[PDB]
Design a protein around this nucleic acid. Structure first.
Ligand SMILES: [Mg+2]
Ligand SMILES: [Zn+2]
Lengths: 674, 625, 161, 237, 82, 30, 226
RNA sequence: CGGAGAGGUA
């Protein structure tokens, strides 16, 4: 997310377009965007097109315009000496697609190769006309869109959704790099600044959870300190753990420690889960998801989150503000946790409502116990307290003495409502977490971990997820193409070291130059047995599953495999919210807004139209009078419900009286005749 | 009628009720103790909470509330978790999927308020869309697939009926559906094989009842032989007892017909229970339908290369003609566009022919569940032409499907047109909101006030103009111009007696009788002609589409009309003459369209002369002016 | 409307909107569009002021126009000339008798200042206004017929208790 | 270990022979575990008796009609097939049904030898007209579950005998569901709702008891590997 | 011709709308009867004067609206318009 | 061939790449 | 057609922690159902032992790092959770692991008291470089199925206590394959082949016995009508 | 808890 933020092209700033005013000619893909701005990975809402992303190979010239590398092709020879062309000069010449079949001899196979002619018109042409060439089939896409495997098999909309989702995956407690990634994951992590790349080659001397100490090849020692369990801008843990031993030798530019979402230096935003593509009893209905309970018991998707609570004691004109332990008009039991200074002892599970920092307000006893407490909907242990004291000549703001701050951390397992999503735009919310017993299990008893509805794939034109599932099965099982008598025809151009792979063999399919369909067919045709000489998944890629709920085998084979899915930062724990009564607004006496200060959901203007259309008059009247801004009405309704008495009658909206006063203030004698 | 509610949300919404019940049950001597018990969640608050929330409707709301059914009242049930559980059938009404959508919960308090929530707004009572009266609690997606699979007859299946061979008696005849189910659970019978059963609980069809029982009826308990598949027996066992046997493959149209017939003939509770049972059956049998996706299931047309080369030759000939100056740029682009459109159509035809009838993709498409064959072509055959940012087609065109994998240029030129779609969707929802607000404001004070103004003014509906050679062809758009009206006059044909009396709802039987009688026009009462001083009358408005009966005397029909016209604004695309949402805006605002095409003012011949940038359309005054 | 009258423009508007909606495969029964069109064709423009106090060129509602003409003829006749007129939905929305509804709809400053000049009194008879003041909307279960039902046990059931 | 809830078996009689049994607080995975086992054991474990084959005089090759009888052969076949007969002898016993002249043929008109008993004497087998005569010989052997028609073992042994499907099981139809039933900080448990429909031979209560016996025997055989093993016990009463 | 209605959907709404003309009428019918039943409940401890308790034997704790709807279904009550 | 040679501790992630790589991805934060 | 042969169960031992049990003759169609009943019972209702909570010397919370270990404490928990214990005491017991100085720290170094026995020595826990000391106290307890982290405040405990999720499942994986004999003679039967694979805490025979006992109890409760 | 801005979800 950070790396994509640092490479964003926002067209809306002071001196730039306005979101409300921006039209439809700017919110578009221009043929000059090829290799300079990504035609995918755009905000899905009102910022559709006003916030782009800089492509992978693009760079900015001294003036400010963007340039993209090419590969100067001369006399039909695709020569090196890349030249960074700009858009204007790009128009003049004719660019060639790198996926074009260069025969390693500086000459295309066929004469007709598609090229962006002048004004982004793709056309064929003879090799003499061709002037330049792309660097890679993977140049127009950005850094987060390049991590989608089988991108060319997804439709632009779903690829955009997947690219915008890879930036939302939460760091899981454990990380697992994809079996079927693309390759833009080691560089996307070493160029993001979260993996601690070694400064200079050397030999690790002492490696611990909090410090590596590279003993350089010149007698110098450079200890790398690991930021353990920190808080990111979005409350997500920032674990860094060493991945080297005390005897290893590292090289300059080598990854020496993992980061938040990393596995051996590569981006790992999710986990590899065994997935079935069948509809199942309607629980995975309309984009919902069914998870196995194994993902909850084994912490397969269990993210650590940290919240940052702060409170300060201002000098104020009156003076004497102090963070004291003794809380006026308080109980002893509630004060047990606080330490001598008045700060909770680190390692205590501060549940919602518990005291964190006893603060008194000497309104120069005039001391309100305005103590920082575990806010509404918070929990978890206290992992760190930071207090800055004026007496310690700290750089505090003007007019304070202490700036105590607390961190509460909480491990959130995956539950019903969380928003797992693959890399292809196949987002959904967990509809049910089935127990591991009643799950479709393969012939060998292995229960599938997740079930995805069949009706979501063909409609949305993101078949790339199915290919990812097949190749994930192939990678997990391992394969061995039998070249006993000549290599197979479908594997002639398959690279060596890919004709045989041991189980759990991570592969990569570059974004636009990866695994063809025939190669997937073949690698499914030849896969190793699991433990006994039984192949659980046939050539089609579909297994014969057993319904764990009833026992009978499903009548037809079911597509199974391993798909990489990511836990998005849209957990249900942050969205559930309810109000019976609480804080009310001040000017208009309506309730307050937002989950933070309790707050109440807004009965919008077009939710009054629905009630009026229903003809429900009394419900609308009560909602607008005795629930919102009829103060006497509100209190009497509460008393009526707590007691047994009938619900009272309404009054006058305080909002209407506010409007009357404002209309008078304008200079208009509004009056309510009789 | 039910919704699942997180217990930790119910505990907060129903806090005063729980406090009162705790004090009542002596679990807290005073209100403060009960409040503390609720705050600390002692193990008995849940026990009293399930009693408290029992039979207390809760209005679930989703934003945007585009139409009336965006707010519906369900019965709360505590569910373990932190997510509201929404019954799958109200998803279409709320327009709610499960990809992260949230919903608001509202609890009415006063006895009046709960009466509205339980009668006016209960979900089970709201099955028909007020915009058109079509059912909205109809099975869809997985339910449609499951019922389509269950109700299918596949020839040559296990346990199929076989005649006598002259050596052994008939085979595949079952004494009752219980025996058929017993055979199916033993593997000897397939739930989609034609069999002859002896039914005694399913009402026979009309013709079979007429030619077997006659008399008065089938008098349940009476037996009759039915040659059908076990699945169709199971499906018809979910319809009401009195419903005639439906031996058909349950496409989504067929299921819609069943649901609408139940709505128009049976009480609403019967319809609700029927849709619930169909939901259960469809969800059960969609799991067993074996619908999955694999690249082996996505078959490709066999001779795609041949067709592509054939049309590439035409493209080459057009290009050479353009090179020799035979035509300009526009003609070349038009010719290539036509060539490649023909190519895409031919490839789609070949792909349609190639797929079997049981391919899961084709099963889901033909089942009416979701999607169309355009998407199937795009996935398997070829995507075809793509649009420039201006709007003109790219003459390349895209030539690789999403199964074979698009090249770099094809993907780029596809994104070209995809982004415009997304952006226009956003801008058009923004515009449709404003249009709906204006429509709700203009017609907020139209209310049914009188039961009948007893006027005679009315409007005439086209109602199936007669054919030239002589035949009564039904007008295609009659469901939205003649049904749910009340006649302003009587109907008499060929000096015959009155076919339909004045003041009739003019439903299916009435329109069928009118067409059989052989009359093409009828005058019906319309709100345009209501004589009430303030608001429309109930008879002029006609049937209330939602309830299926005559509109009530307090109905706020203006807001309903505004919402019904303004809810399908997102569906209506924003696509020099305006032809979309801008056209609707400049219509309802009556601004000056886009091109004010002149209209005639008097009858007579025209003496048009042709020029450039103008004409001379002069109309002779046949009247004589 | 000027050439073929109000009925023709009504059918034309209904047909146009239905064409636009049918093109996109959306079914809306014509009675909703008819309600809206009825609302659009409510007023008449004043050609001749006459003895009645109607400024020429001012669009007044049909009820007021007819009633004032019928009053004037009964008490010193000089009937006023009036042509049927078509108004967009914004003009019709802002021309309401209630300055409160029009003010809450759009152009609050213009509506409020013109109301202040004309000293208009708002009969709180609408739905939006009754919502604003927090009184029962005159619709559905707010009609005088329904809010004043008289429930009571029957004499037989009363005795049985 | 011990389970603190101990589900409760409650029955709700609907018809003279049709019930809807409801268990209750079942640990939150046992609604199906025992439900489907009980369904299949109710269907095919319970011994019963049904007609295996019949022979009708006058019908050897042509199976289109029976002379002197209004109904075709297949209707007679599937009317006899729905004959609730209970037997004790393990051997296949033979029954004869003969009637002459116009009238109605009823299940009571078949003479049952010592053994087989017709639990539904009133059942419309056939009608007769024009001095018609019917004489059909049945064979009954006690079995279990549903057994489709068995083809002739020796074709030369009999030419008139024709086999029919055998619904040995006295239980006709069983269906089950599960629901969530608890407010005890855990609204996640199961409630199995059986729906047993049986013939006149056995009341659904006794059929459910027999299925329970069968499953107890099978799972006791399973448990015999280790008697003193630690497991979950519902407890006595 | 239906299975036993369960919960909020009991009694059937059509059998209720038989006693009245409009759902708007049944709304106020049930609301007013529920108010009267609640008034009886709150007056039982105090001096019972005119608020007559429910007529159909109320369930274990059936809320007043449910009892009123059952009474309207059994047709104990009577209503007049205004 | 494989993932890459530029990074020393690159995991052995085999690639289905057919085309070669004339250039290496620049510094992304550059 | 009254098949007269009662089912008989025979066992096959493929290895110490796996075995195939064969049950025949079952009535046709009643193989899958019985096998699935046994599978469901085995995968959810087999009692076992697991660690309930821990306490390491110099850590107050579970989001810190012991000095001298390459494993953050969280990874230590993730490693410990893969232990395979078999306890006989019906009450919480305690186990201690003590190490100091260079060398890897594995489950073999654990010293259990009488009763509980660690069934997979040598897996992994942590590595100590030069100056790391690990003194971790475990609390083994008996249970069934799955039980989330027992809250520290709800059950009175100290600040240094770290509740750990407990998965008591002694069964690892289960399946079955039914061999159905379909013959025109109609002397049909089903042969079930149950493959129980336990995680070395209890032999598959014990797990099958526990499942049988549970199902016998339930269907005996179902046998109270007549 | 009032304003301004940014990002995001449906
Ligand atoms: Mg959604
Ligand atoms: Zn009228």
């Amino acid at each position: 997310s950070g790396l994509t933020h640092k490479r964003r092209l926002s067209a809306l700033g002071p001196g730039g377009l306005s979101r409300e005013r921006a039209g439809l000619e700017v919110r578009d893909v221009h043929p000059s965007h090829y290799g300079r701005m990504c035609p995918i990975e755009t905000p899905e809402g009102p910022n559709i097109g006003l916030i782009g992303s800089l492509s992978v190979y693009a760079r900015v010239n001294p003036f400010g315009f963007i340039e993209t590398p090419y590969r100067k092709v001369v006399d039909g020879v695709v020569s090196d000496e890349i030249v960074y062309l700009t858009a204007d000069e790009e128009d003049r010449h004719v660019v060639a697609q790198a996926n074009s079949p260069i025969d390693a001899d500086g000459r295309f196979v066929e004469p007709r190769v598609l090229v962006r002619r002048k004004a982004g018109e793709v056309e064929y042409v003879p090799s003499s006309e061709v002037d330049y060439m792309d660097v890679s089939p993977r140049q127009m896409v950005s850094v987060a869109t390049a991590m989608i495997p089988f991108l060319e098999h997804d439709d632009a909309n779903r690829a955009l959704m997947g690219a915008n989702m890879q930036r939302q995956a939460v760091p899981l407690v454990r990380s697992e790099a994809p079996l079927v990634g693309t390759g833009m994951e080691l560089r996307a992590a070493i160029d993001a600044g979260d993996v601690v790349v070694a400064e200079e080659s050397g030999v690790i001397e002492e490696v611990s959870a909090d410090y590596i100490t590279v003993m350089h090849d010149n007698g110098t020692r450079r200890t790398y300190r690991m930021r353990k369990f920190a808080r990111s801008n979005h409350g997500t843990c920032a674990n860094q753990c060493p991945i080297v031993d005390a005897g290893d030798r590292v090289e300059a530019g080598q990854v020496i420690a993992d980061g938040p979402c990393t596995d051996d230096g590569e981006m790992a935003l999710g986990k590899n889960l065994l997935v079935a593509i069948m509809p199942w009893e309607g629980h995975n209905y309309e984009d919902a998801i069914i998870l196995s309970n194994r993902l909850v018991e084994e912490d397969v998707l269990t993210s650590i989150h940290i919240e940052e609570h702060e409170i300060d004691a201002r000098d104020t004109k009156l003076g004497a503000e102090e963070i004291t332990r003794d809380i006026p008009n308080i109980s002893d039991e509630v004060l047990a946790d606080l330490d001598e200074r008045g700060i909770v002892r680190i390692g205590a599970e501060v549940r919602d409502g518990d005291i964190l920092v006893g603060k008194v307000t000497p309104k120069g006893r005039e001391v309100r116990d305005t103590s920082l407490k575990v806010p509404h909907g918070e929990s978890g242990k206290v992992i760190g307290i930071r207090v800055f004291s004026r007496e310690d000549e700290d750089e505090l703001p003007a007019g304070v003495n202490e700036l105590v701050r607390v961190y509460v951390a909480q491990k959130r397992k995956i539950s019903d409502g969380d928003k797992l999503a693959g890399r292809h735009g196949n987002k959904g919310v967990i509809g049910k977490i089935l127990p591991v017993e009643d799950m479709p299990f393969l012939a060998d008893g292995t229960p599938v971990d997740i079930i995805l509805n069949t009706h979501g794939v063909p409609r949305r034109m993101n078949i790339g997820q199915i290919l990812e599932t097949h190749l994930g099965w192939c990678a997990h099982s391992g394969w061995k193409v039998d070249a006993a008598k000549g290599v197979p025809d479908w594997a002639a151009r398959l690279p060596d070291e890919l004709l045989e792979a041991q189980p759990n063999a991570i592969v990569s399919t570059p974004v636009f130059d990866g695994a063809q369909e025939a190669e997937l067919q073949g690698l499914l045709s030849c896969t190793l047995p699991n433990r006994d000489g039984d192949v659980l998944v046939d050539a089609d890629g579909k297994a014969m599953l057993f319904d764990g709920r009833s026992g009978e085998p499903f009548p037809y084979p079911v597509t199974v495999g391993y798909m990489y899915i990511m836990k998005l930062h849209h957990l249900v724990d942050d969205k559930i919210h309810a109000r019976s009564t609480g804080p009310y607004s001040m000017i208009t006496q309506q309730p307050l807004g937002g989950k933070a200060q309790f707050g109440g959901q807004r009965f919008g203007e077009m939710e009054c139209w629905a009630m009026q259309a229903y003809g429900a008059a009394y419900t609308l009247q009560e909602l607008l009078t005795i629930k919102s801004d009829d103060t006497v009405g509100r209190v009497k309704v509460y008393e009526a419900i707590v007691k047994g008495e009938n619900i009272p009658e309404p009054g006058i909206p305080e909002s209407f009286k506010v409007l009357l006063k404002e209309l008078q203030s304008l200079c208009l004698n509004v009056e309510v005749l009789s | 009628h039910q919704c699942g509610l997180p217990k930790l949300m119910a505990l907060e919404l129903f806090k005063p009720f729980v406090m009162k019940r705790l004090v009542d049950l002596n679990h807290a001597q005073n209100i403060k103790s009960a409040k503390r018990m609720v705050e600390r969640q002692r193990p008995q608050v849940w026990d009293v909470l399930e009693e408290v929330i029992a039979e207390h409707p809760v209005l679930l709301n989703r934003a945007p509330t585009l139409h009336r059914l965006g707010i519906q009242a369900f019965e709360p049930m505590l569910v373990e978790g932190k997510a509201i559980q929404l019954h799958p059938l109200v998803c279409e009404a709320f327009n709610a999927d499960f990809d992260g959508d949230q919903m608001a919960v509202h609890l009415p308090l006063s006895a009046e308020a709960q009466a509205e929530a339980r009668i006016l707004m209960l979900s089970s009572n709201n099955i028909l869309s007020p915009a058109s009266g079509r059912p909205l609690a109809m099975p869809r997606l997985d339910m449609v697939t499951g019922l389509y699979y269950l109700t299918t007859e596949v020839p040559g299946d296990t346990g199929e009926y076989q005649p006598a061979s002259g050596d052994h008696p008939e085979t595949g005849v079952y004494s009752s559906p219980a025996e058929a189910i017993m055979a199916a659970d033993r593997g000897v019978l397939s739930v989609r094989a034609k069999i002859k059963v002896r039914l005694t609980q399913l009402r026979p069809p009309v013709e079979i009842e007429a030619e077997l029982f006659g008399h008065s009826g089938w008098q349940p308990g009476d037996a009759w032989m039915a040659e059908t598949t076990l699945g169709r027996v199971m499906f018809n066992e979910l319809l009401p007892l009195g419903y005639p046997f439906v031996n058909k493959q349950m496409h989504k149209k067929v299921q819609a017909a069943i649901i609408n017939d139940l709505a128009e003939r049976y009480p609403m509770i019967v319809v609700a229970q029927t849709v619930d049972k169909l939901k259960d059956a469809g969800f059960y049998w969609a799991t067993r339908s074996g619908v999955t996706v694999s690249m082996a299931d996505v078959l490709v047309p066999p001779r795609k290369k041949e067709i592509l080369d054939h049309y590439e030759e035409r493209a080459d000939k057009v290009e050479k003609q353009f090179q020799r100056g035979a035509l300009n740029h526009d003609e070349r682009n038009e010719a290539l566009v036509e060539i490649w459109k023909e190519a895409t159509d031919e490839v789609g035809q070949a792909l349609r022919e190639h797929y079997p009838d049981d391919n899961p993709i084709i099963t889901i498409v033909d089942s009416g569940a979701t999607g169309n064959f355009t998407q199937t072509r795009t996935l398997a055959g070829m995507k075809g032409l793509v649009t420039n940012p201006k709007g003109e087609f790219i003459p390349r065109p895209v030539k690789s499907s999403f199964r074979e994998g698009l090249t770099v240029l094809e993907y780029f030129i596809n994104t070209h047109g995809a982004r415009k779609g997304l952006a226009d969707t956003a801008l058009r929802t923004a515009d449709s909101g404003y249009l709906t607000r204006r429509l709700v404001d203009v017609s907020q004070d139209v209310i049914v006030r009188e039961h009948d103004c007893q006027t005679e003014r009315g409007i005439v509906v086209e109602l199936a103009e007669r054919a030239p050679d002589g035949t009564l062809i039904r007008d295609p758009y009659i469901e939205t111009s003649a049904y749910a009206r009340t006649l302003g006059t009587d109907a008499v044909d060929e000096a015959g007696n009155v076919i339909v009396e004045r003041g009739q709802d003019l439903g299916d039987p009435e329109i069928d009788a009118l067409l059989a009688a052989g009359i093409t026009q009828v005058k019906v009462r319309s709100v345009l002609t209501c004589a009430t001083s303030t608001g429309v009358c109930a008879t002029c408005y006609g049937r209330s589409m939602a309830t299926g009966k005559l509109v009530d005397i307090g109905e706020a029909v203006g807001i309903v009309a505004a919402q019904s016209i303004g809810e399908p604004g997102t569906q209506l695309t924003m696509r020099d003459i305006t032809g979309g949402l801008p056209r609707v805006q400049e219509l309802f605002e009556a601004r000056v369209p886009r091109g004010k095409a002149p209209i005639a003012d008097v009858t007579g011949r025209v003496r048009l002369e042709d020029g450039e940038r103008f004409y001379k359309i002069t109309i002779v005054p046949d009247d004589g002016g | 409307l000027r050439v073929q009258g109000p009925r023709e423009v009504q059918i034309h508007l209904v047909r146009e909107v239905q064409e636009v909606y049918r093109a996109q495969g959306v079914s809306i029964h014509d009675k909703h569009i008819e309600v809206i069109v009825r609302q659009m064709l409510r007023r008449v423009t004043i050609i001749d002021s006459g003895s009645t106090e109607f400024l020429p060129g001012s669009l007044i509602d049909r009820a007021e126009f007819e009633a004032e003409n019928r009053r004037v003829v009964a008490e010193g006749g000089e009937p006023a000339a009036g042509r049927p007129v078509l108004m967009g939905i914004t003009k019709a929305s802002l021309a309401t008798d209630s300055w409160l509804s029009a003010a809450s709809f759009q152009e609050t400053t213009r509506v409020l200042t013109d109301a202040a000049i004309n000293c208009r009194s708002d009969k709180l008879n609408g739905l939006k206004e009754n919502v604003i003041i927090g009184k029962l909307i005159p619709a559905g279960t707010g009609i005088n017929r329904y809010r004043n039902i008289a429930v009571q046990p029957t004499e037989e059931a009363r005795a049985a208790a | 270990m011990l389970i603190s809830q101990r589900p409760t078996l409650s029955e709700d009689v609907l018809t003279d022979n049709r019930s809807q049994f409801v268990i209750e607080p079942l640990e939150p995975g046992f609604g199906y575990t025992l439900g489907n086992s009980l369904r299949r054991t109710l269907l095919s474990s319970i011994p019963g008796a049904a007609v295996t084959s019949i022979r009708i005089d006058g019908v050897l090759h042509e199976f289109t009609t029976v002379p002197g009888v209004k109904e075709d052969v297949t209707e007679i076949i599937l009317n006899l097939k729905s004959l609730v007969v209970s037997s004790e002898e393990d051997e296949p016993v033979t029954m004869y049904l003969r009637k002459q002249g116009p009238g109605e043929v009823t299940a009571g008109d078949i003479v049952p030898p010592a053994g087989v008993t017709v639990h539904n004497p009133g059942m419309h087998i056939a009608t007769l007209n024009d001095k018609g005569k019917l004489e059909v010989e049945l064979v009954v052997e006690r079995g279990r579950g549903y057994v489709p028609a068995v083809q002739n073992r020796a074709s030369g042994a009999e030419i008139g005998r024709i086999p029919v499907d055998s619904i040995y099981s006295p239980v006709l139809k069983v269906t089950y569901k599960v629901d969530a039933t608890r407010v005890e900080q855990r609204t996640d448990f199961d409630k199995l709702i059986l729906d047993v429909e049986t013939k006149n031979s056995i009341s659904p209560r006794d059929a459910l008891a027999s299925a329970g016996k069968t499953l107890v025997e099978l799972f006791g055989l399973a448990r015999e590997l280790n008697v003193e093993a630690e497991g979950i016990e519902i407890g006595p009463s | 011709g239906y299975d036993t209605p369960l919960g909020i959907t009991n009694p059937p709404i059509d059998e209720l709308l038989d006693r009245v003309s409009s759902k708007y009428a049944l709304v106020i019918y049930a609301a007013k009867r529920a108010r009267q039943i609640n008034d009886y409940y709150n007056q039982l401890g105090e001096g019972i004067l005119e608020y007559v308790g429910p007529l159909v034997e109320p369930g274990l704790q059936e809320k007043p609206l449910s009892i009123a709807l059952r009474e309207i279904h059994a047709d104990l009550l009577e209503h007049t318009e205004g | 061939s494989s993932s890459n040679n530029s990074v020393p501790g690159a995991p052995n992630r085999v690639s289905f790449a057919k085309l070669r790589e004339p250039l290496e991805v620049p510094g992304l934060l550059d």
